[PDB]
């Protein structure tokens, strides 16, 4: 069957028994930087299995009035294992990812999620004179949440699914690598993101390569007398992580 899969990376392994294939974003599979595309002249450290391995993030509760969740990368893995340690000590990094979303339910539950990895998901702001602040772009391992309707603030992110937090049709986030999790079909999504940037390597705190957004397009619904807590778990492994520009820890 096509519904059963395992992905083994490092000392971690994930199993699925319902899945709707694997999306390889832009048809490019993660790899180390070549000698003809390099520009950092020091030897790169490649920690291999010690950084490339699934890291489970904090789970979010799917409710009937939920409007979605987002996690920015690499800043959701900034405190995760030795992946986050090698971010501390290095000026440059460069990594692809396999992102795996889990959300099982019974056959008497219904709902549909869009799972999409958006490169360069620069976000708007409630006040038009101000930039959104870091605390509102990022929650780390915890997700930031979309809201159903428009919000107000000064440095708050403008959240409202219809605009997707970016001023674009939310229905058009399908030219970006994506899968859907529809509870009557599959219980997992898998996206494999290559490294995508216009520079061959970049700092891992000052820049977010992509944002994973999970947006309900068909609300959660079930008859009362069924399970009322349904989590969505995001477990994501780095792939081909390498770092250059070793110096003391920090980022300021």
């Amino acid at each position: 069957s096509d519904r059963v899969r395992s992905i083994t990376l490092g000392n971690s392994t994930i199993t699925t028994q319902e899945c709707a294939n694997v999306v390889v974003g832009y048809g490019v599979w993660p790899d180390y930087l070549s000698d003809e595309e390099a520009t950092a002249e020091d030897q790169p450290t490649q920690p291999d299995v010690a950084t490339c391995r699934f890291y489970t993030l904090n789970s979010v509760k799917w409710e009937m009035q939920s409007a979605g969740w987002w996690w920015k990368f690499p800043d959701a893995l900034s405190e995760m294992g030795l992946f986050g340690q090698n971010m501390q000590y290095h000026y440059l990094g460069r990594s692809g990812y396999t992102i795996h979303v889990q959300c099982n339910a019974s056959k008497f539950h219904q709902g549909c999620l869009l799972v999409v990895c958006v490169p360069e998901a620069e976000m708007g702001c409630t006040n038009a004179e101000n930039a959104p602040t870091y605390g509102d772009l990022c929650g780390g391992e915890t997700a930031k949440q979309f809201e159903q309707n428009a919000v107000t603030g000064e440095t708050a992110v403008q959240t409202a699914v219809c605009n997707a937090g970016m001023g674009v049709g939310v229905g058009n986030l399908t030219i970006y690598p994506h899968q859907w999790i529809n509870l009557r079909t599959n219980n997992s999504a898998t996206i494999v993101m290559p490294y995508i940037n216009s520079v061959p390597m970049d700092n891992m705190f000052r820049h977010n390569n992509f944002t994973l957004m999970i947006i309900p397009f068909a609300p959660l619904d079930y008859v009362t007398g069924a399970s009322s807590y349904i989590p969505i778990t995001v477990t994501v492994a780095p792939m081909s992580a390498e770092y250059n520009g070793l110096r003391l820890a920090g980022h300021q």
Partner: protein, 57 residues
């Protein structure tokens, strides 16, 4: 001199271009490159999905 076909119909038909500058940024824009590869957006899946078969077996 470079001699290349013009855009023409449907059911003479060449033009001549000579570059006059030492930079390739000075050159006229390339408008006759019609290569495509829609499959990296339209079919970006690890396993090849055959149309006639079930998506999910």
């Amino acid at each position: 001199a470079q001699v290349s076909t013009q855009k023409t119909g449907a059911h003479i038909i060449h033009y001549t271009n000579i570059n006059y500058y030492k930079d390739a940024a000075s050159n006229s824009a390339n408008r006759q490159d019609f290569t495509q590869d829609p499959s990296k957006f339209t079919e970006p899946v690890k396993d090849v999905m055959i149309k006639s078969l079930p998506a999910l077996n």
